[PDB]
Structures are given as structure tokens and as C-alpha cells.
Amino acid sequence: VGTRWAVLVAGSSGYGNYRHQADVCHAYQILRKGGLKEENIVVLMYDDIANHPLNPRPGTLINHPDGDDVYAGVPKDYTGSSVTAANFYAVLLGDQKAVKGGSGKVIASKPNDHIFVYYANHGGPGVLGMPNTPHIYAADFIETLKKKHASGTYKEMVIYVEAAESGSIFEGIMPKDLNIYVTTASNAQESSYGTYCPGMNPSPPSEYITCLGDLYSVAWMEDSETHNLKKETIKQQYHTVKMRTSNYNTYSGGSHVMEYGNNSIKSEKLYLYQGFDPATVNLPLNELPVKSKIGVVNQRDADLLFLWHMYRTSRKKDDTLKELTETTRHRKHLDASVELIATILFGPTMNVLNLVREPGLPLVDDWECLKSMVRVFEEHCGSLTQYGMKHMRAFANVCNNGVSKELMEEASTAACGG
Ligand SMILES: *[C@@H]1O[C@H](CO)[C@@H](O[C@@H]2O[C@H](CO)[C@@H](O)[C@H](O)[C@H]2NC(C)=O)[C@H](O)[C@H]1NC(C)=O
């Protein structure tokens, strides 16, 4: 007879990343309808979307083309500059003192309690995005889970992670004895996908020129809201989500949903974590959920999709056209910087830094070195940005190949100085 807790985190901001905060708000409504209490649900979101100037319906958020508002009622626990990696860890550990700013709500859980964690944004190999730097590094996240387990302040925990290369956050480092079960949107090397976007099928209402959701996220949320959670197992949800996210085993506009931690937890019913909604119990015959294939966009290209459609539907015309050209060239400049550093170190052909480790291995052996090499890069080449998280394997392999900090500095200066 425990208490059910939850942490909902959006790791991004900006109207181009509408979907991520819409994902989280939708997740909150599902938990509330299921009977979870607001005091037991901590929400971390930048909160810049609902009243964004570009929002055609101010004060609302939708996570589906024909969907209703999901923004109303969502608590403002940690918004704006308080959405940090440090606050996320502190909330999860339930240490109210370590929290800086915000409402001060934390997961002060007890040994018999259940915890549900859901992250949604951007990502890269070994890294999860945050709207305020520094980003989340996998080792710090796993270590936080270890301390939480050591305190023994929970019975079991389930974690859902929506991000690109999200499997890399847990592979090679996530233990199976922490009473934690984890699912991720993709494996350690592949892209994730956003959905309900303009120019595709299905599309949002024409006034929306940005993506409403993400494939993996809307997969489990639409699943939970249309099924009896007293009957459905975690095992069944994983199976359904994996199938939809893979675009039904075609992997064309789809990714590989991965799982980590203790798999025996999968036998349990979803209501122990997500609550139970009586409305879903014995639905009439003609209202049973029927799912079909949906168009998607690469998670890292959803930004460009937003800028291009805003250009098409439009002096705001060229302000957007100019922002499109500048964004494109900034990304290519950043790609060139990483490529040049790799080329300087190990050459332009069969570059050793581009080698992907076998499934099951950790991305990097020295995680503190990974942080260090990123700082060196940013000191010379400028901020890596959330887009630049795609290049994180290059920095990881610099550490794995034992390249010293001095040589990285030398290569970074030659590549970006001037
Ligand atoms: C993996 O998770 C299970 C629970 O799903 C942990 O618990 C075992 O299963 C029964 C279920 O009632 C418990 O009462 C026992 O205490 C556990 N038995 C054994 C043999 O473990 C299980 O311990 C977890 N495994 C690990 C390695 O932590």
C-alpha cells in the first residue's frame, strides 16, 4: 500500500521544440486521470510554449492533431532557468536542500513507494539535453539512481526516455540490481523521430507549423489512455510501443526501442506506476482504439521543418528565410569543426574516431574525460548546442583512444582558432 510518485522532464525550449513540452504535459494529464496526486508529481519544463507569440492558440498545448488541451492544470514546479541537470538529480534523490529555486517539490519517497520517471527532448551518444547548460551526462544520471537505491527510499522504479541515441544513456553502465526497469526510444547509435508535423500525414491543424509530438512518446501515452491499466502489463506496453515506434518492423521512419535494468518488473500491471482510469474500463465496441502508420521527421531535422513551413505560410517571410539560412550554415559550420578535429588527429580516411562500439559496451570508459574534451572544444569552437550532441561519439572516442587533453587543445585551436 505505497504512494505513487512521478518525475516529468522536458529537456528543451523554443517554439521549434513545441512537441517536447507538449509530450510532458500530456503525460501529466494521464497520471492525474489515473489517480496520481499533484503533490507527488514533479514537473520540470521551460514553460515558454503556451504563451509563445507564435502559438496560434495561447494558453494551450496539444499533443495530437485532433487532441484537446493538455496544458491546463500542470504545476510550475521548475521552469525557466531552474530547469537544470542539478535540480533534476536533487528532485529524484528527494533532497529538498540541494534544490535551487522552484517550488521545492521533490521525490520524498518511502521504501514501499513506486516511482515513474519520464524524460522527453533531444539527445546524443551518452548525453541528454537540458534547456540550461550543462546537459545531462549518462554517468551522473546512473550514479544518481545508484544513490537513490542505496537510500532504499523506494520499492521499484520505471523510466521512460524519449531522446536520440537514448540507448547510450544506459548501455554498459546501467545495473540490473537497482529495482529499476528502463525503456528508451532508440538504440545507442540511431536517430529518434518526431511526429504529427506539417507537410506530412497526418498533419496538425494548418495554424500549427511545428510538430506536436514524438513517435515513441505518443506511442505509450495513446496506449495508456485507451487501455485498462489494471489489466495491461508493462510487458504488453513495451511490446506495443516497440512495434509502433519501429513503424511496424520496417524501421523506415522508425527506431529500435530498447530496454534495460530488471526485466522481471515487466510482469507487473501498469496501474502500479501510471494509475488507473475507470473511463477506459469496458469501452463500447465502436470506440476501441485502432492505430495505423504515421508520418515522421528525424528528431534533429524537426527544427528545420518548422522554419521552412513558417517561411511557406508567411517582412516576417524573410526574417524566417534568413533564420533558415543562418541555422543551416551554423549547423554545417559545427559539423565541419568536429570533422576537422577528427581529421587532424587521425586523418580523412577510415578515421578511427568514427568507429561505433558493439552493442552492450559503454560509450566511453572515462566519463570525466568526456566532459573535459567537450569543454576544450567549446573553449575554441564555441557552444556545442543541442544539435551538436549528435557528434558526442567523436569526443568519446578521443578519450577511448587515450588522446591527451593537450593534443585535443592543439587540434581544437588549429580547427577553430581564427
Ligand atoms: C528483479 O526484480 C524482482 C521483482 O520483480 C526482484 O524480486 C524477486 O522476486 C520476488 C517477487 O515477489 C521477490 O519477492 C523476491 O524477493 C525476489 N527473488 C529473487 C530470487 O530475487 C529481484 O530480486 C530483482 N533481481 C535483482 C537481481 O535485483
Author numbering: 48 to 361, 366 to 469
Verbatim from the authors:
To understand isoform-specific differences between different AtLEGs, we determined the crystal structure of seed-type proAtLEGβ to a resolution of 2.0 Å. The asymmetric unit of the tetragonal space group contained 12 independent molecules. Like isoform γ, proAtLEGβ comprises an N-terminal caspase-like catalytic domain and a C-terminal legumain stabilization and activity modulation (LSAM) domain with death domain-like topology. Overall, the structure of proAtLEGβ closely resembles the structure of the homologous two-chain AtLEGγ indicated by a Cα root mean square deviation (RMSD) of 0.49 Å. Similarly, in the crystal structure of proAtLEGβ, we found all twelve independent protomers in the crystallographic asymmetric unit to engage in symmetric dimer contacts, which were mediated by LSAM–LSAM′ interactions. In contrast, the proAtLEGβ dimers in the crystal structure were predominantly mediated by the α7 helix. This interaction was formed around the symmetric H384β (H392γ) and further stabilized by one symmetric salt bridge (E390β–K383β′) as well as by a hydrophobic contact of the α7 C-terminal LFG motif (396β-398β) with W355β′ centered in the α6 helix. However, modeling a proAtLEGγ-like dimer uncovered repulsive charge densities of α7-α7′ helix contact residues in AtLEGβ (R380–R380′, K373–K383′, and D369–D386′) that will prohibit this γ-mode of dimerization. Together, these findings suggest that the observed β-dimer is weak and probably only transient in solution. Comparing the crystal structure of proAtLEGβ with YVAD-cmk-inhibited AtLEGγ, we found that the AP binds to the nonprime substrate binding sites in a substrate-like orientation, similar to what we previously observed in mammalian prolegumain. Gln346 is binding into the S1 pocket in an unproductive orientation and thereby preventing cleavage of the AP and further blocking substrate access to the active site.
The plant cysteine proteases of the legumain family (C13 family, EC 3.4.22.34) have an important role in processing and maturation of seed storage proteins within the vacuole and, therefore, are also referred to as vacuolar processing enzymes (VPEs). Plant legumains are structurally related to the mammalian caspases and exhibit a strong substrate sequence preference for cleavage after asparagine and, to a lesser extent, aspartate residues. Structural analysis of plant legumains showed that they are synthesized as inactive zymogens composed of a caspase-like catalytic domain with AEP activity (AEP domain) and a C-terminal death domain-like prodomain (LSAM domain, legumain stabilization and activity modulation domain) that are connected by an activation peptide (AP) harboring the α6-helix.
